[PDB]
Design a protein around this ligand. Structure first.
Ligand code: OGN
Length: 504
């Protein structure tokens, strides 16, 4: 047999017809169609009144999206007796083999029925439902001249990996609550279910800590390149968490330590050996900063930060970073990371950390390794200790330029086009591990505007999202590429300022 790899498309990027991404476990189409009309209602029914109430909220979220593009005023009804023309969302009789996020979605001429095990699965299935309707449905303003049809179809679906995440770096350049919510919303439509906020680094500190107010008064006042920076109040952070929770997205906050800490060191002189505040940094160097690993004030500082963050962050996880502590000795790093893990655990939080944090003698089997290095030796400790692993290989470093000539992005992991972001498997990064899942990391050294974020995340994130959701056996670039071409108008309709990748 004859095989080939993909080159660029001749004559430039290519960038009744559903466009499901990520690819579902099964999808068949039959004769006939459902028509969504102005008289449609969404019916919801759970196994008890509390569950029905939860489904009702999910239903209203779906109605909101449908109403924006159709111009209808679809409303939601608590009833298990849907009427012809209805969408019906239910958890009664879900197929347990599909798990928490799985669902069946069967569209007949008279009715759309989404059957899941849990409300979470209904929400994930609704993302598929939106992709079954015609291009135009994802507009934020009313679209005329499009019949709102869904082909008779049968879908069953569940994720391959439990953790399918996006990290946004808000330290290097700041992004507003509105901007963050928008990225969470867009990502949720592709079944991303985790959002990791990199809230602190050398160039900025972005979360209000009431006990150490100069982290904001001093530490938040800049960013890479000398812009004004910004921060989230604790109320704003709670609002982001709430918005994510409505999309069944867990928010994992990161306070990077003991490295990547210049903003803290610039805020409080007492965190430095000489007692003086560091000058703020607006460059892009990494690796040079460190907390004092053998001073108790360091651990008081960390405890205060963790106490306040834990109080406002419902995720069972806090990310304590641990990357590039090049001004910290191996012995001091081992000791430091063990100490801060104990602090986090005492406040009821399990610790996530970048490699080599798994090597700390103070880690537990409940700690999680975020494996970004993806070398043969990375995560040897994690594996031995039974720690879950989240992979972030080169193919998930979405801040990498698509090509040599990309106008934004870095390139220390090489270029990452839409094909490279697709053509990998989590087992490529690490062998013999309990792989919890994948996280796409959007570092922001070179991204200043919302348009920059859109350009680098789309279509790259779509590739990563499919790697997280769709089983390896059913992933195929030639297939995905053609599906992505078909999906393009939907990106445009959403107002995403995507890159029209010439490999698509
Ligand atoms: C865990 C992690 O990602 N840490 C930092 C970095 N780590 O980047 C490098 O180590 N770069 C590098 C390595 C060798 C040669 C030249 C650059 O990459 C990112 C940009 O992609 C951000 O700067 C992160 O703060």
């Amino acid at each position: 047999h004859h095989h080939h790899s993909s080159g660029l498309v001749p004559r430039g990027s290519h960038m009744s017809q559903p466009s499901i991404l990520p690819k579902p476990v099964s999808y068949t189409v039959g004769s006939g169609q459902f028509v969504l009309t102005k008289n449609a209602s969404i019916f919801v029914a759970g196994n008890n009144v509390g569950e029905t109430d939860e489904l009702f909220n999910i239903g209203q979220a779906l109605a909101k999206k449908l109403n924006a593009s159709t111009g209808y005023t679809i409303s939601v009804v608590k009833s298990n007796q849907p009427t012809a023309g209805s969408i019906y969302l239910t958890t009664v009789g879900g197929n347990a083999a599909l798990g928490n996020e799985g669902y069946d979605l069967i569209t007949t001429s008279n009715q759309v029925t989404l059957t899941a095990n849990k409300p979470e699965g209904v929400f994930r299935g609704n993302q598929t439902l939106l992709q079954l309707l015609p291009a135009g449905i994802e507009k934020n303003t009313v679209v005329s001249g499009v019949q709102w049809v869904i082909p008779h179809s049968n879908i069953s679906d569940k994720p391959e990996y439990e953790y399918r995440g996006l990290m946004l770096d808000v330290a290097r350049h700041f992004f507003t609550v509105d901007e963050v919510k928008r990225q969470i919303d867009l990502a949720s439509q592709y079944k991303i279910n985790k959002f990791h906020m990199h809230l602190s680094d050398d160039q900025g500190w972005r979360i209000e800590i009431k006990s150490w107010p100069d982290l904001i008064e001093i530490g938040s006042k800049g960013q890479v390149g000398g812009g004004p920076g910004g921060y989230y109040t604790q109320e704003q952070f709670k609002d982001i968490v709430s918005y994510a929770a409505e999309r069944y997205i867990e928010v994992i906050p990161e306070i990077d330590m003991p490295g990547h800490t210049n903003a803290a060191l610039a805020s409080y002189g007492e965190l430095n050996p000489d007692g003086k505040r560091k000058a703020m940094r607006t460059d892009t160097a990494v690796g040079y900063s460190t907390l004092m690993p053998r001073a108790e004030i360091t651990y008081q500082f960390v405890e205060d930060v963790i106490s306040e963050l834990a109080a406002i962050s419902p995720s069972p996880y806090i990310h304590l970073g641990g990357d590039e502590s090049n001004a910290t000795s191996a012995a001091d790093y081992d000791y430091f990371f063990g100490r801060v893990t104990a602090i986090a655990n005492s406040y009821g939080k399990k610790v996530v950390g970048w490699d080599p944090s798994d090597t700390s003698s103070g880690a537990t089997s409940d700690s999680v390794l975020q494996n970004w290095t993806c070398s043969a030796s990375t995560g040897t400790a994690a594996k031995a200790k039974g720690m879950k692993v989240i992979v972030s290989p080169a193919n998930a470093y979405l801040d990498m330029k698509y090509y040599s000539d990309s106008p934004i992005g870095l390139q220390w992991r090489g270029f990452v086009n839409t094909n490279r972001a697709y053509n990998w498997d989590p087992t490529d990064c690490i062998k013999g591990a309990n792989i919890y899942g994948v996280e796409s990391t959007l570092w922001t050294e070179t991204f200043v505007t919302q348009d920059h974020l859109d350009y680098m995340l789309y279509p790259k994130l779509l590739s990563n999202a499919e790697v997280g959701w769709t089983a390896r056996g059913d992933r195929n670039w030639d297939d995905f590429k053609e599906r992505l071409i078909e999906h393009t108008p939907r990106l445009q309709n959403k107002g995403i300022k995507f890159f029209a990748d010439p490999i698509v």
